[PDB]
Structure formats: C-alpha cells, structure tokens
C-alpha cells in the first residue's frame, strides 16, 4: 500500500480528530444560528474615513477605542428593489454565527431609518485579485498556501450545511499576516440536500449550476478548482467575451493547462473540474479527504495552517493603522439618513 503502519495510523487519527472538531463546531454554530446578535452599536460611534469597495464598504474608526473597522452599508430601499431582502438578512445571520480563522469577523451590527450596517474587522492587505493581477501568477507553493485555507474553510462551512457559491479572488482578502479572509456571504445558503438557484460569477460556475438540474455543496469544490487554476496560471480555465460563451465552455468541460503546471497540479484540477458528479473530488465516498490527501497537498501541514503557524509567502505592506494603500479608490457619496423610517417591517430581524 501507499502507507506503512505508522503513516496509516497517523492519517486515520487526524481524520477522526477533524470529525471531533466539526461536531463541536456545529453545536457552537447552531446555538448562535438559533439566537442571533443584534443592534450592538450605532452610527455616531464611528468616523467614516474612506470607501474600501462597492452597497458600499467603508473604513471607519471607533471613536471611543480608536480601532479601525470595515463597515458595510446597505440601502434598505435598494435591497428591496433588487429583491435582496432574504440575501441580506441571511448574510448577517451567517456572519454572526460562524467562527473560523479564515472567515471575516463581524464585530457590530445595527440599522437606522435608511440603512443596514455590518461592522467587520478591517483586513488591511487588500483583495487577492489585486495581488494576483499585480504579479501575474502565483508559484505553486504560494497558490497551495491559499488553497489549503480555502479547503479548510469549505470543510468547516460544509459541515454546517452551508454552501458558499461566491468564491473568486475578488472575494478573498489578505490579512496583515498574509493569511486569507473570506467576507461575502450574500450568496451562501444553508441547505442539506439539493438547491437550484442560478447565482455566482460566470467563470466560477459549476456546470450543474448553469444547467437546470439541481446541485449541492460540490459546486464549491468545482469553484476551488477554478480558483487554484487561476492562481497558478494567472487566468481562469474558462473565459470568453460574453458569459453565454463561457457557459458553453464550462459545460463542455474540456480544460487545458499551461505548460508550466506540475503533473500533480493537473491531476488535482482534472478531479476538481470534473463535470461528472459521480467522479468529482469532494463529492465522493471519501469526502474532503480525497482533496486533502492528494499528492499536490503532500507538503501541506493542515493543523499548522489552521493554527496560523506556517510562514506566509506574501506579507502586505502596512504603513500604520488605517492605511488603505492596498485598496483601490472610489468616489465618496455622503451617507444620508432619512427623517422617515424605510422598509421597517421587512428588516425587523436585522
């Protein structure tokens, strides 16, 4: 066999320890899932500094403590117009219930007459997208460091019956230690069986999202394949001028690789970007272990990644607190709070 007695015993114990950890993690999550947190601050506790992204996310500073945060501002009337009510309430509910080193932490939340506010920790290193486009492509060890954190995060989320559905470099931030933070849960859904919603980003959609058939958590493992491909190649495996042409390529599944990709990497990606759900890694009898035990991850110490004891390959430049130099610039619209309360009934639970 591939493992002698010692290595076999070690791997089996590690995999049982994961089960033990996830059982406790799920009990913790479900407690907060059932009894959420609300209205833990108000607007005038913060000074607005700068727009980090676009509703809109702004760097703010806590007046009392001087701590910096990223505050997401949603216009209640806009969310209603876009039929986003359920999406927004669910994002807040998820963020206040989960807990994992690579998931952004919601520190405060509140609402006023016009807006909903989610105040999260400030992740100063900017988006992965920025650094990927800046250096072109990541070397395989670099790409693997990020990928391992996504694998652990999806293992955690999937144990809670959460499907993520929004993976892409634009939605992954780099923290001051060089580790990844996942932030956007507007498309996540808690569902045990199949679901059908057409949502996500074209380059990252699994075939079974595109096609009318139902799908399950395995779409996230397809999206991991897309992410790892894009990190290591510098462009995604399926693209074209228009989303319709992208979907046609995805459903064909004919994937080609750069000549510098290792054989281990191509083998992993062929098993993740697998159109046949009966064969896709992450969807088989052995679950996530088919991925974590793949040769491309042989040098990955999963506990050490989780414990954040691995040296990161890239450490963002931080010129002090409140430095936004790793983010793009956006036009600054003033925050307006109406005399009159808007859509109060629809957003009671926030």
């Amino acid at each position: 066999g591939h493992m002698g007695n010692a290595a076999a015993a070690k791997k089996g114990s590690e995999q049982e320890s994961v089960k033990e950890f996830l059982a406790k993690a799920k009990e913790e999550f479900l407690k907060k899932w059932e009894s959420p947190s609300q209205n833990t601050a108000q607007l005038d506790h913060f000074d607005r500094i700068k727009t980090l992204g676009t509703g809109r996310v702004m760097l703010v500073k806590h007046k009392e403590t001087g701590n910096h945060y990223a505050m997401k501002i949603l216009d209640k009337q806009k969310v209603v117009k876009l039929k986003q009510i359920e999406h927004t309430l669910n994002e807040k509910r998820i963020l206040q219930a989960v807990n994992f080193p690579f998931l952004v932490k919601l520190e405060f939340s509140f609402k006023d007459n016009s807006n909903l506010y989610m105040v999260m920790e400030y992740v100063p290193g900017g988006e992965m997208f920025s650094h990927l486009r800046r250096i072109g492509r990541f070397s395989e060890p670099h790409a693997r460091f990020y990928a391992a954190q996504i694998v652990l995060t999806f293992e955690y989320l999937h144990s809670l019956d959460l499907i993520y559905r929004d993976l892409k470099p634009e939605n992954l931030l780099i923290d001051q230690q060089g580790y990844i933070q996942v932030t956007d849960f507007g498309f996540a859904k808690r569902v045990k069986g199949r679901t059908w919603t057409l949502c996500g980003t074209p380059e990252y959609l699994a075939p079974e999202i595109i096609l009318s058939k139902g799908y399950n958590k395995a779409v996230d493992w397809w999206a991991l394949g897309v992410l790892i491909y894009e990190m290591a190649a510098g462009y995604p495996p399926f693209f074209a001028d228009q989303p319709i042409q992208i979907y046609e390529k995805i459903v064909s599944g004919k994937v080609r690789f750069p000549s510098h990709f290792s054989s281990d990497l191509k083998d992993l990606l062929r098993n993740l970007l697998q159109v046949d759900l009966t064969k896709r890694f992450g969807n088989l009898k052995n679950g996530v272990n088919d991925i974590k035990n793949h040769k491309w991850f042989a040098t990955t110490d999963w506990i050490a990644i989780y414990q954040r004891k691995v040296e990161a390959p890239f450490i963002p430049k931080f010129k002090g607190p409140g430095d936004t130099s790793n983010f793009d610039d956006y036009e600054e619209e003033e925050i307006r709070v109406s005399i009159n309360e808007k859509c109060g009934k629809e957003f009671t639970e926030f």
């Binding site: 997208f129 486009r133 929004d166 892409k168 634009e170 498309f187 057409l198 949502c199 996500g200 980003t201 074209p202 380059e203 510098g234 462009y235 693209f239 074209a240 001028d241 989303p243 080609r256 750069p258």
Partner: peptide, 18 residues
C-alpha cells in the same frame, strides 16, 4: 496564446456576479 486571448476577452478586471 491563451493569455493573449484572456487579455482580448475584456474580462481581466473585477468580475460581477450574474
């Protein structure tokens, strides 16, 4: 090359959800 096709696709910037 594949990269040049990617540049020519116009989808090299930030991508929006559908």
């Amino acid at each position: 090359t594949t990269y040049a096709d990617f540049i020519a696709s116009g989808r090299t910037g930030r991508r929006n959800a559908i």
